[PDB]
Amino acid sequence: MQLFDLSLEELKKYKPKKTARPDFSDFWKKSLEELRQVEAEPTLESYDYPVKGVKVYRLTYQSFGHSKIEGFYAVPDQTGPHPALVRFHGYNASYDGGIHDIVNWALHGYATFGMLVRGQGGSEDTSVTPGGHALGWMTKGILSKDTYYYRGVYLDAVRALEVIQSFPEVDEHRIGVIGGSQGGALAIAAAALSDIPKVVVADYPYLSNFERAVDVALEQPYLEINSYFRRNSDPKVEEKAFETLSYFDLINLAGWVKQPTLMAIGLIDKITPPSTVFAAYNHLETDKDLKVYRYFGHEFIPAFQTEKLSFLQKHLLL
Amino acid sequence: MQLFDLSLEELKKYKPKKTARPDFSDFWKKSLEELRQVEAEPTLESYDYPVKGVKVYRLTYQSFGHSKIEGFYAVPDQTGPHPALVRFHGYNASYDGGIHDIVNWALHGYATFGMLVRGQGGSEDTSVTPGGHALGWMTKGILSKDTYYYRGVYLDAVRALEVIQSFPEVDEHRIGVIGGSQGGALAIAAAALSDIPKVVVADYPYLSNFERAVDVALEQPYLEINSYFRRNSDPKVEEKAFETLSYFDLINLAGWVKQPTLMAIGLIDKITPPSTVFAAYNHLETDKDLKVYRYFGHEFIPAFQTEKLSFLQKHLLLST
Amino acid sequence: MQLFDLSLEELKKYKPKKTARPDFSDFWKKSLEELRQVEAEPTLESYDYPVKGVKVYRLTYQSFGHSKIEGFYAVPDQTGPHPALVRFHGYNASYDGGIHDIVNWALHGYATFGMLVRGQGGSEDTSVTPGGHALGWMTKGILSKDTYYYRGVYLDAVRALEVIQSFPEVDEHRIGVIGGSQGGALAIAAAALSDIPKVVVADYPYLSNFERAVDVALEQPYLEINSYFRRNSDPKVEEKAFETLSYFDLINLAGWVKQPTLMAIGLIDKITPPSTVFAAYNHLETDKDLKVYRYFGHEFIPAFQTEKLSFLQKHLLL
Amino acid sequence: MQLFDLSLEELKKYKPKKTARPDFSDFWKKSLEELRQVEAEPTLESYDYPVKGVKVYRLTYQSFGHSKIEGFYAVPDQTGPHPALVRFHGYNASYDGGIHDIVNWALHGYATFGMLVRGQGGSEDTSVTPGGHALGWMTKGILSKDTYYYRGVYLDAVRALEVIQSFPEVDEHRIGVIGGSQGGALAIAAAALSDIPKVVVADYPYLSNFERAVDVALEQPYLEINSYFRRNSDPKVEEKAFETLSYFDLINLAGWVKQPTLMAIGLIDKITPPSTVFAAYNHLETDKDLKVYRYFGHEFIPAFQTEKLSFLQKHLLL
Amino acid sequence: MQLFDLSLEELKKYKPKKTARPDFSDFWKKSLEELRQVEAEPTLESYDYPVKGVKVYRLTYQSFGHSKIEGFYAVPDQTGPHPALVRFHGYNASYDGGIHDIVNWALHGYATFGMLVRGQGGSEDTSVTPGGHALGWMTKGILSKDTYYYRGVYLDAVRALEVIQSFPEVDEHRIGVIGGSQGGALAIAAAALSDIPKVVVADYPYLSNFERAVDVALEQPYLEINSYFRRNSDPKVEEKAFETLSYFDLINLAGWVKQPTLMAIGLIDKITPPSTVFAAYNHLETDKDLKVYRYFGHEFIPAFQTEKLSFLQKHLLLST
Amino acid sequence: QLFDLSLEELKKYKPKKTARPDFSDFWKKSLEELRQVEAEPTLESYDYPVKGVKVYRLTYQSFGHSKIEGFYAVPDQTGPHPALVRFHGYNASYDGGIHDIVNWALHGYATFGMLVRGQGGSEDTSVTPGGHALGWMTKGILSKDTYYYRGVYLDAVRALEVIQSFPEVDEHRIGVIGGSQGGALAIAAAALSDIPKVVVADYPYLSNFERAVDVALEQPYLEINSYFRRNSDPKVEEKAFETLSYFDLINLAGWVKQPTLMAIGLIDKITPPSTVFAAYNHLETDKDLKVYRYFGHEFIPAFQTEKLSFLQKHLLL
Ligand SMILES: [Cl-]
Ligand SMILES: [Cl-]
Ligand SMILES: [Cl-]
Ligand SMILES: [Cl-]
Ligand SMILES: [Cl-]
Ligand SMILES: [Cl-]
Ligand SMILES: [Cl-]
Ligand SMILES: [Cl-]
Ligand SMILES: [Cl-]
Ligand SMILES: [Cl-]
Ligand SMILES: [Cl-]
Ligand SMILES: [Cl-]
Incomplete structure (x- = not known):
């Protein structure tokens, strides 16, 4: 689907001014x-799955707004402590909790939890809908x-790390956060808001450089935002919307990441444009690396999977 | 586009078995x-608009779950009482509250309120999201x-009628409910749950005959439901989902409508298939009429607009 | 969606050299x-329509080439004189004469006539077809x-103003011309060829800057022109065609407009490209204003409707 | 691609009731x-073309409404009389008069004239536009x-035969009419209105069985008609339109064809649906044959070209 | 994206006449x-991969026409014998030999070999191109x-089983063949031509009921065949082409399958139409089961993956 | 619509050759x-409904002992006749393009429409070394x-050697023509053989691969991209472009000494203007490029006139 964004030379130098507000x-x-004012009160319940050498559970815990967050948790069936992973799924891209992928990660040796994003793949969202917004989650409650x-x-992502870290079978010093697109953004944001994770792997992260996006x-x-402005033409609304978005934009959070980070980007990605990634x-100031794949877009990149496994193995599995 | 559903001869006879549960x-x-447990506590605030002969206001009121529902209210600038209309907008199809259309309805002589549907064109939705669902509103909290x-x-639609009818400038005996697609469904559902409205006009109503849809x-x-099932393959989930939907399906509510009703349908409509409409x-048992337009789909149908105006005029503007 | 034309900064400075020939x-x-050699001989016939407070008529009149032009005429049912509007419809975009919109305009207080464009929404076209041309009206008789x-x-648009102006219920000093795309172009061209109209409102005007279009x-x-050249490859035909078009191009007619003008443009408009508008x-030298809408294309722009009503009310109604 | 119309078994049996009016x-x-009241007054003008053994001319003649019809005429450069062909082009599908194809037909031994259809590939159309209609020629003046x-x-097609037949180098007893789609319809209509042509070859003929089309x-x-009804919703207009169309529908004219006829149809044709062909x-009652091509649509069918050449050679050349 | 083939009721009874020729x-x-006349002469070369508990190799062997077939072979890093799987990839759908999936299967406890299909994901194809054909592999050498x-x-598929079965770390009595679409067809064809495999799992198998396809x-x-006929209009060519295809059509080979079989089909599959599957x-006469998924097409079906894993576990991993 | 470099830039676009030292x-x-393979050509009359032209099915042996085929049409009159070897487009040959071949003969040219290996016809004995993307573009691309x-x-060159040996053909009046893939074969043939007198290529394919x-x-062209997606090893991409350079027109054009006529549509999305x-x-000979603003990868009527005039001037006489 051919090149369309800035040239590779320009992309390497693209570093937009932060939009973070004083507060x-x-x-x-x-x-x-x-x-922190909400008690985690986690619960585990065994879940049958046709696999040998791995025990699967359904995990739930309380988070911001007293919302019950859920997801599958797979553990290597052997004596720990085990290195762990918190996997975040893509936007409206979770099928049956992505249980098959969670189990496979456990087979690779990682105690893995696939947090389900509020209202998408699972999990409850107690936050109210303040007013009208465009079809989707991107603009829900965007005016504040x-x-x-x-x-x-x-916050759910951060709480996920606090819950996983407290498990006896988990080695709190070997926890990683991974995900693609929306998942990549959650991984980076979590690592930015918490020092629990040791490493970060993000495939073409979403929620970045909104104003250019x-x-x-x-x-x-991303275009859900454009749809929102079409339905609410008040100029002050557009201004306020971008003000809100800045608090969640990766270009403003990246600076807080201290963990080694591995990222990937396909140069023909039309969903998470190369420039935004x-x-x-x-904007990251840490041990980092960005793998650039000329012929791929917003999809599974085989070559990067190798990089990913090698990276996690080096920093966690040992 | 182009014919695709049942033949017209079959459509006229299509009447699927009700799916309403015993409760x-x-x-x-x-x-x-x-x-009823929630006090309406309505509020009106004048809103400037470049038009002569009409006063516009922003109306709000409390509804189910203590949600603050909003919308524009336009009134003919003359001594009443005035016949009234509650207009419902389409799915994710409301731009700036559809104020221009609201104003024009008022210019036609109707005190008009365009209720904004929760989270879409406006209005607050306090109902929580119990769990995962597909992108959109169609499957939010569908497991119950x-x-x-x-x-x-x-319920917001019903409450809209209760608020409008309490206004002194409004003639409670000449109130109509109108809308297209999602709006047509809300008009029909409101008339089915309340005897306040005198007539109903629904352009190719949505939320009807879900299992065939x-x-x-x-x-x-409609396909948002298909998307939901793809993401939640548990067979019991599909069963449960359709159970829930049956409580809101027009084929089960239509029977309660006693007001004269006018409907429209384009035979090449791919969004609200002819068979579902x-x-x-x-399933309606009342003074009714369905205008069929061979060459139109899910869109504004000029010829139907004339039928609509004539119908509302005969039952509301020039009556009683 | 998405931007594709020149940047906003460039658009504000875009002013192509006039292509008007010396004659x-x-x-x-x-x-x-x-x-002028054709007697208007207008006729009015009452037309029933389910609306209170407005009288509707079918209006006809003779114009260039002795063609019978038609359209609906709606008048506020009250003593005048009334301010008036001549509304022009879009290319092949007239359904049932746009009667519903005409009636609504009258409800807003304007004696309104919706001129139907030859062979499109109505009206007779006595002009012969000199020779072959591409499917559509854009290249009919384009070789001269x-x-x-x-x-x-x-010419029909000009004659429309002469007919409306002569009506007793109409205040000749408060007449406006409006329209979108093809309609916007006709409004501008009519205001350029006649001093009868007091104001002009044109939504993303068509028939402008042909060579770039x-x-x-x-x-x-616009692409009908490209289709025409594909079917008639003679180089002299292309030269001749653009010569003809220059006599109707808004960049050459705009200079004659002396009335206050209000225009609109969506930055993602692919039919009437931002640069052409x-x-x-x-090229306008008059009291003017261009409303730019980032998130809209060739469509109804709600925010602009407010601008439009305000502008017409200020100059005509009040 | 894929099948979509009636099954082949049903197609062979499909014979809709004629819609011809009593008059x-x-x-x-x-x-x-x-x-007949218009004098042909034909003119020939040599036209240079890079080919040996063929002389090309630009031919013009007067027809219905005193319209000047044109087209290229190619003649084998040798002693005649020569068998002849009048080729009709497709809807809005004529590029540079289809000169290259006309010359090739001459190289095959046929004095060939490619009549240009009014306002499309060429030729003048003096008929006035009574009123509004949809974009295109399909609904021009359709209310009568x-x-x-x-x-x-x-009528131009009939006159074309009268002109060609009068040429000394042409053998009036060996003239054929050919064309595809719109061209096929004109060939059939011409053969139905005139006994001048000896044979007819029509590739998936258009303008047939309008009500089903x-x-x-x-x-x-064909959908231009649907567009017309969308813009003019009066029920009487739809009734009137089909009334007019019946006078030109091939299912009502086919019965008059007495000449040997060869037709072709691709089962996945979405422009001229199989059932209409x-x-x-x-409806033809004459020496006929219909070649059915399962894997082709509205396009050039190689296998049929061989059938066509053989058929013309058998009845005209040999 | 929507139903288009025969109704479910009709699909269950759809069983077209075999097209197998007398020979x-x-x-x-x-x-x-x-x-058989070609000696396998297999070779193994260790291949590094970032995974613990699995050893990966590049496997090659000689097959029909003396073609060198290749693929990745992953083995659980523990004492065997191990149950085994021969996985076949989809049409032009192999990326880097599908190594990541092969390794995961080994992590599930299966000695796995992902045979690469001639000229597609890998492997050499010594067979000559007799003449013209349409873009793709579907019509190469189709006139015979x-x-x-x-x-x-x-034949490569069969030879793959003979090679894997000869490995000491492999339990010859617990070998399964799996794959989707083209892979499903290869799995079924292999099981039909060889009694080495114990079970078969095929996701919406391709190369079935060509004349309807x-x-x-x-x-x-499938449409590559249509493209072929467009380019070669001779009627005898079409007749000859279908004659050739019949020798490879699953409806003619299914009857030879004696192993327990598990299949899947999405009702909106546009690539391998429901009717063909x-x-x-x-046409199968054996312990079989077909999982039908209303809302899925030619894609990964989550729910079926669970069925697949349970099925393979029951017959291979947890048995003997 | 326009998408490539501006016309002014196109006229100056001349990428550095990528030809390897060998x-x-x-x-x-x-x-x-x-040369090691004997042509051993064969002719068989083929019936066709046309007067004044004899058609034959021609075959001959070429590289790898592959039997190449195609239709050969000859003006039914005493020769010698000027001749043409026409090459067809990628996967775009229907029934050998016999109707076009016959028409060329009617124009006075002894014409042979060589069918490209495995596409419109002809046998391809070359083995498939390994995996590649759907299509012919990447078959055996690693070498x-x-x-x-x-x-x-090589088949194209051999076609010229066979046609030139026919008694009814005037070896000094032979032209090579074709569009896209056919244009590339025409240019490549003229570059590898001095047999053809002139060349006509409509928007030639297989040119400037790295930019394509x-x-x-x-x-x-995108089949190459597909190939890289399926084989991510960086060394494979490097190797692939190394192989392609041996066949790229920008490296072969320099060898063309015959008068050449080319065409290009500015909205061509298959063979982008810049690559043409x-x-x-890169041509250093009597040449001319016809530029058509409103056309893409298709039959360009105006160019057909240029083509016929050009062939008539240099061959027909
Ligand atoms: Cl909000
Ligand atoms: Cl993408
Ligand atoms: Cl729910
Ligand atoms: Cl629709
Ligand atoms: Cl003209
Ligand atoms: Cl647009
Ligand atoms: Cl008419
Ligand atoms: Cl078609
Ligand atoms: Cl073959
Ligand atoms: Cl599919
Ligand atoms: Cl290779
Ligand atoms: Cl193109």
């Missing part, structure tokens, strides 16, 4: 505090950072 | 009771009739 | 004279300014 | 009389058989 | 003999059963 | 392997010796 840090500090959809999601993306779901990457 | 009526009785998205919406529709949003119409 | 003014002078399709149409448009109907606007 | 025959009698676009076209076609140009074929 | 059996007997593309492929498929690659299934 | 040695050795077009190019894979929007200008700008 950026304070907002997350207060948000994390509201999260306190009501925005991803506020709860980001709405002008370059050619496919959903390079933007996030170029 | 169908009980469910709506209890739902209306929960609505108590949590389903349209429960609140239907998911197998015949070729475009969104005929299904709703054929 | 430009003489051609229109002669054309207006041929028009005297035979070109829009010659008659532009054929190289930037991505949808019909800015070109027409930038 | 069908009288209408064409009167039309042919109005044509006297004003309908194809009335002049059909508007309900089965999936592509232009079988309809025309099944 | 069907003799052709395969002769072909297997030509294969001896030259047809899939003759070598089917070319008239119902809406996407590639039901046809293959209904 | 470029000429490779073709010299390949032509020698071809210049095994690449699909090696045999095809980044600019083309439709098949079949690239080939043209």
Whole structure:
């Protein structure tokens, strides 16, 4: 689906000015505090699955707004402690909790939890819908950072790490966060808001450089924002919307990541445009690496899977 | 586009068996009771608009789950009482509250309120999201009739009539409910749950004959249900989902409509398939009429607009 | 969606060199004279419509080439004089004469006439077809300014104003011309050829900057010209065609507009490209204003409708 | 691609009831009389073309409504008399008069004239546009058989035969009419209105069984009629339109064809649906044959080209 | 994206007449003999991969026409014997030998070999191209059963089983063949031509009921045959082509399958139409089961993966 | 609509050659392997409904002992006749393009429409070394010796040698023509053989591969992209372009000494304007490029006139 974004030479140098508001840090500090006021009260229930050498469970826990978050948790059937992984799924891309992939990760030796994103693949979302918005989750409660959809999601991700880390069979010093697109963004955001994860792997991360994204993306779901503005023409609404988005934009959160990070990008990706991903990457100040794949788009990239397994193995499995 | 559904001869005879559960009526009785428990507490605020002979306001009121419902209210700038209309908009199809259309309806002589559907064109939705569902509103809280998205919406529509009818400038005996697709469904559902409206006009109503809809529709949003089942393969989930949907299906509510009704359908409509619309119409037991337009689909039908205006004029503007 | 034309900064500065031939003014002078030679002989016939407070009629009149032009005429049912509007419809976009919209305009207080464009939404076209051309009206009689399709149409628009102006219930000093795309072009052209209209409102006007339009448009109907050249490869035909088109191009007519003008443009419009619209606007020397809508294309723009009503009310109604 | 119309078994049996009005025959009698009142006054002008053994000319002649019809005429450069062909082109499908194909036919030994259809590939159309209609020629003057676009076209086709037949280098006893789609229809109509042609070859003929066509076609140009009804919703207009169309429908004209006829049809044709073509074929009462091609649609069918050449050679050349 | 083939009720009874020629059996007997004349001469080379508990190798062996067939072979890093699987990939759908999937199967406890199909994902194809054909492999050498593309492929599949079965770490009595679409067809054909495999799992098998397939498929690659006939209009060519295809059609080979079989089909599959898959299934005379998924097409079906794993576990991993 | 470089830039676009040091040695050795195979041509009359032309089915042996075929049409009159070898487009040959071949003969040319290995006809004995993407573009791409077009190019040269040996043919008046894939074969043949007198190529394919894979929007150049997606090893991409360079028109154009006529449509999405200008700008001979603003990868009427005039001027006389 041929090249369309900036040239590779330009992408390497693309580093848009941060859009973080003066109260950026304070907002997350207060948000994390509201999260801490909710007792995790996790629950585990065995779940049958046709596989040998792995025990699967359905895990739930309380998070921001007293929402019950869920997901499958697969553990190598042998004496631990085990290195662990918190896997985040893509936007509206979760089928049956992605249980088959979770189990396979456990077979690779990792205690794995696939957190289901509020209202998408699973999990409850107690946050109210303040008013009208475009079809989808991208603009729900977008007129305020306190009501925005991803506020709860980001906090759920952090809480997921706190719950996994507390498990006896888990080695709290060998926990990684992974995911693609929406999942990549959650991995990066979690690593930025918590020092629990040791490493981060993000395939073409979403939710990055919003202001350029709405002008370059050619496919959903970034365009849900454009749809929102078409339905609410008030100029002040557009201004306020981008103000809200800035608190969740990866270009403003990347700076907080201290963990070794591995990213991937396909140069013909029309969903998460190369420029938006390079933007996030170029704002990272840590041991990092970005794998660029000329002939791939927003999809599973075989060559990167090898890089990913090698990276996780090096930093966690040992 | 182009014919694809049942032949016209078959459509006229298409009347699927009701799917209403034994507790169908009980469910709506209890739902209306929960609505009654919430005080309307309506509010009006003047809203500037470049038009002569019409006063526009932003109207809000409390509804099911203590949700603040909103919408524009336009009134003919003259001594009343005035006949009134509650207009419902299409699925994810509301731009700036559809104020221009609301104003024009008022210019036609109707005190008009365009209720904004929860989370779509406006209005607050306090109902929580019980769990995962497909992109969109169609499957939100679908695993239970108590949590389903349209429960609140239907009640908001009923409450809209109760608020409008209480206005002194409004003639409670000349109120009509209108809308297209999602709007047509809300108009029919409101008239089925309330005897406040005198007449109903619904352009190719949505939310009808769900079990056939998911197998015949070729475009969104009925297909959101198909998407939901793809993401939740548990067979019991599909069973449960259709159980929930039956409580809101027009083929089960149509029987309660006693008001004169006018409907429209384009034979090449791929969003609200002709068969699903005929299904709703054929379940109506009242003074009714269905205008069939061979060359149109899910869109504005000029010829029908004339039928609509004539119908509302005869029952509301020039009556009583 | 997505942007594709010149950047907004460039659009504001885009002002292509006029393409008007030295006999430009003489051609229109002669054309207006041929028009004058035809007696209007207008006729009115009451037309029933389910609306209170407005009387509707079917209006007809003779124009260039002795063609019978038609359209619906709606009048506020109250003592006048009334401010008036001549509304022009879009290319092949007239359904049942657009009667519903005409009636609504009258309900807003304007004596309104919706002129039907020759052979499209209605009206007779006595102009002969000189020879072959591409499917559509864009290239009919394009090998000569005297035979070109829009010659008659532009003249009909002028004659429409002369007929409306003569009505007793109409206040000749408060007449406006409005329309979108093809309609916007007719409104501008009529205001350029006649001083009868007081104001002009044109939504993304068509028939502007032809030479750039054929190289930037991505949808019909500008592309009908490209289709024409594909079917008639003689190089002299292309030269001749653009020569003809120049006599009707808004960039050459805009300079004659003296009335206050309001225009609109969506930055993702693929039918009437932003650059072609800015070109027409930038050639206007009058009290003007161009509303730019980032998220809209060739469609009804709600926010602009408010601007439009406000503008018409300020100059005509109040 | 794929099948979509009636099964082959049903197609062979499909023979819709004629829709010809009681004055069908009288209408064409009167039309042919109005044509006779116009002097052909043909003109020939040498036209240079890079080919040896063939002389090319630009031919023009007067027809119905005093319209100047044109087209290229190629003649084998050798002593005649020569068998001849009048080739009709497809709807809006004529490029540079189809000169290359005309010359090739001459190289095959046929004095060939490629009549250009009014306003399409060439030729003048003096018939006025009575009123509004949909984009295209299909609905021009459709509210009356006297004003309908194809009335002049059909007569031009007949006049083409009268002109060619009069040429000294042409053997009036060996003239054939050929064409595809619109061209096939003109060939059949011409053979139905004139006994000049000896044989007929029509590739998937258009303008056949209109009432079924508007309900089965999936592509232009039959759908222009549907577009017309969308823009003019009056029920009486639909009734009137089909009334007019019946006078030009091949299912009503086929019965007059006495010449040997060869037809072709691709079972996945979405422009001229199989059922509409079988309809025309099944209404023919003459030496006929229909070649059915399962894997082809509205396009050049190689296998049929061989059938065509053999057929013309058998009846004309040899 | 929506129902289009026969109704479910009709699909269950769809069983087209076999098209096998009188020399069907003799052709395969002769072909297997030509294969036997080629010494396998397999080779193994360790291949590094970032995984713990599994050893991966690049495997090659000689097959029909002395073609060198290749593929990745992953083995559980523990004392055997191990149950084994021969996995076949989809049409032009092999990326880097599908190594990641092969390794995962080994992690599930199966010695797995992912045979690469001639000229597609890998492996050499020594068979000559007799003449012109349409873009793709579907019509290569189609004018003769001896030259047809899939003759070598089917034999390679059989030889794959003979090679895997000879490995000491492999339990010859617990070998399964799996694959989707083209892979499903290869699995079924292999099980039909060899009694080495114990069980078969085929996701919406391709190469089935060719004569119906070319008239119902809406996407590639069945349509490559239609393309072929467009380019070679001789009627005798079409007749000859279908004669050749009959020797490889699953509806003619299914009858030879004696192993327990598990199949899947999505009702909206446009590539391998439901009718063509039901046809293959209904021609099977063995312990069988067909999983039908209403909302899925030609894609990975989550729910079926669970069925597959349970099935293989029951017959291979947890048995003997 | 326009999408490639501007016309002004296209006229100046001349990418650096990618030919390897052994470029000429490779073709010299390949032509020698071809010479090793005896043509042993055969002719069989073929019935066709046309007067004044005799049609035959011609076959001959070529590289790898592959039997190449095609229709051969001859003006039914005393020769010698000027001749043409016509090459068809990628996967675009229907029934050998017999109708077009016959028409060329009616124009006065003894014409042979060579069918490209495995496409419109002809046998391809070259083995498939390993996996490749759907299509012929990447068959045997990991080596210049095994690449699909090696045999095809040699078949084209052999076609000229066979036609030239016919008594009814005037060896000094032979032209090579074709569009896209056919244009490339015409140019390649004229580059590898001095037999043809003139060349006419409509928007030639197989040119400037490295830019083609980044600019083309439709098949079949994109088959290469598909290949890389299925074989991600970086060394494979490097090797693949190494192989392709031996067949790229920008490296072969320099050998063409015959008068050449080319055409290009500015909205061509299959053979992008830049790749065609690239080939043209690498030609050092009597040449001319016809540019058609409103056309793409299709039959261009105006160019057909240029083509006939050009062939008539240089051959027919
Ligand atoms: Cl909000
Ligand atoms: Cl993508
Ligand atoms: Cl739910
Ligand atoms: Cl629709
Ligand atoms: Cl003209
Ligand atoms: Cl647009
Ligand atoms: Cl008319
Ligand atoms: Cl077609
Ligand atoms: Cl073959
Ligand atoms: Cl599918
Ligand atoms: Cl290779
Ligand atoms: Cl193209």
